Automatic annotation (TrEMBL), chains A, B:
GO cellular component terms, semicolon-separated: cytoplasm
Whole-protein coverage range: 85 to 424 of 427
Top-level taxonomy: Eukaryota, Metazoa, Ecdysozoa, Arthropoda, Hexapoda
Biological or metabolic pathway of the protein: Pheromone biosynthesis
Protein name: Farnesyl pyrophosphate synthase
Keyword Magnesium attributed: yes
Family affiliation: Belongs to the FPP/GGPP synthase family.
């Protein structure tokens, strides 16, 4: 584990040292106060995350680019491209903050909870989104992959936004609509809202930056990475509930657990779920959890984990079109901890 | 004014006839319900406007294109470009709808006031933005001017968004901040928030579609159109207050009337302004109007109107770079009625 922990320690360090200049480039005439605000706004919201997708975008580029092309100039560009994915993520996080009434995030108060923002938070998000596209043009307009980069940041915005709509259908009456809690509906929410921009975007951008725009190479990659995206979400689902210290449950969220509990429940075990899911009481949340252990979900998942791991391993090694296996094996092995 | 009225009747008719084929092309697999929503959502929000910007885009393209290129295929393209500008305007209107608590608009209730939307109105705005970028891709990705079209839509979102920040500084604590009510600040608010995307974008898109990207031919057009943009704003401000059937005043808006009143006010006359501007009461509103008449604002405007007209007229005929004068004279004359 020592090489990994050290190269990560300095990869993250190189990456964090490029942000300051992204800010500075976006601020250097009628409205100088708007440029000051875009500074504050970027420095509070974008660089304080765990930086997974940004790091994934640069990790992917190193793994995919030809060695005679791993120049400090191309490294910095893979690096600025990471910060464009982080910006896109911040845009998404901030819109959802206002939509869902989030109070605390990144261990600090949500941007919109400041007195002089409130719903004006929505415009502040529009400023981050625009900074992203400005930054995308200033670093990349000269590149022959430039159109496909803008198309992918655009396709990804569509994909998240359909993803949020399908999710909202799942709350009719500030109470969850359990009839919609199917594995087709959870797989689709998970794919659109999370997997596209969290797992594919970083890798399809790194592929583009490499001059690889082969349509079949892109599908091949996406096919595996979306599965991987679903796995991450299921595991996320199982630590929210059976975590070792999550509000999914008192929140009536569409989880893998609630979908699989409904597949296996007696009409009597369905009735307890209707009565106790998405209710913010220790009792209701405790009842839902007794039932989760009664339908043997911890075992069921354990078996799912072991098997799905071997399926995706087998599916990696059957990937071709020049793509490195050691990239997908590395994304699998990291989202398995 | 019969040919203009008849050509304008069938131009509006040709344009309205393209909209349904724009919707049907955005709706023809995991989330079929999201495609049905996007249709409902375009159908209520985008084509029910007075359609000025979308009409301005096609009017400018017919004026700017060489005649041997005025083919039904190129006309249909100009006509989908108009609908992409309107989709930009709808995005802007809806975000503003939620931010300012608008209740009615276009003779119907605002989207976000429906029970199944509320703050989810913000994601429906992202869906409209995405549709625009998709629609831009499926029609224009072949063209060499494609990269420049995306950049213009991106730049215009930056500009609106800085314009919206600068506007929010003017209402501190629900009381208007009369220290900031200067002509420099009103000109910048109007330019960033309205003029750029209402008066420039249409013409610069039509110029791009024509194959003209000359930096200096864009600059000349941009100067004139920004000034015309500011004029339409000053006129709109005047009728808002002196118009023959306006809530600016009770709303503490930075209008040309309040800015110029503060330039001419006696210190006593600044007091009546600090005591009666942004106060929703028949007495305060009526007092701001007694002052506006006392300071002789109807006259000053009347002089401003006549003078600014002859200035722009003259600035039009000074324009070269092959640009048609008959385009600018027509915009000038149509915002002078």
């Amino acid at each position: 584990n020592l090489y990994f922990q050290s190269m990560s320690k300095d990869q993250s360090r190189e990456f964090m040292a490029v942000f300051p200049d992204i800010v500075r480039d976006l601020t250097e005439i009628d409205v100088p106060e708007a440029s000051k605000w875009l500074a504050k706004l970027l420095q509070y919201n974008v660089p304080n995350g765990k930086k997974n997708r940004g790091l994934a975008t640069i990790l992917a580029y190193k793994m995919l680019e030809k060695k005679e092309n791993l120049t400090p100039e191309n490294i910095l560009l893979a690096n600025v491209m990471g910060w464009c994915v982080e910006m896109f993520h911040t845009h998404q996080l901030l819109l959802n903050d206002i939509m869902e009434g989030t109070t605390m995030r990144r261990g600090v108060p949500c941007w919109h909870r400041r007195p002089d923002v409130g719903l004006n938070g929505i415009n502040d998000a529009a400023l981050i989104q625009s900074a992203m596209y400005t930054s995308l043009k200033r670093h990349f307009n000269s590149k022959p992959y430039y159109n496909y980069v803008l198309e992918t940041f655009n396709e990804m915005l569509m994909k998240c936004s359909m993803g949020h709509y399908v999710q909202k259908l799942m709350l009719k009456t500030d109470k969850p609509d359990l009839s919609l809690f199917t594995m087709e509906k959870y797989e689709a929410i998970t794919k659109y809202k999370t997997s596209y921009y969290t797992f594919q975007m970083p890798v399809s951008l790194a592929l583009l930056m490499t001059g690889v725009d082969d349509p079949e190479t892109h599908r091949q990659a996406k096919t595996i990475l979306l599965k991987m995206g679903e796995f991450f979400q299921i595991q996320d689902d199982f630590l929210d509930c059976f975590g070792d210290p999550g509000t999914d449950i008192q929140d009536g969220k569409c989880t893998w657990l609630a979908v699989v509990a409904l597949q296996r429940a007696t009409p009597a075990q369905k009735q307890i779920m209707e009565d106790n899911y998405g209710v913010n009481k220790p009792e209701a949340i405790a009842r839902i959890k007794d039932l989760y252990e009664e339908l043997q979900l911890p075992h069921t998942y354990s078996v799912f984990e072991e098997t799905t791991y071997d399926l995706l391993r087998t599916q990696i090694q059957q990937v071709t079109r020049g793509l490195p296996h050691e990239l997908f094996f590395k994304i699998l092995d990291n989202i398995f901890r």
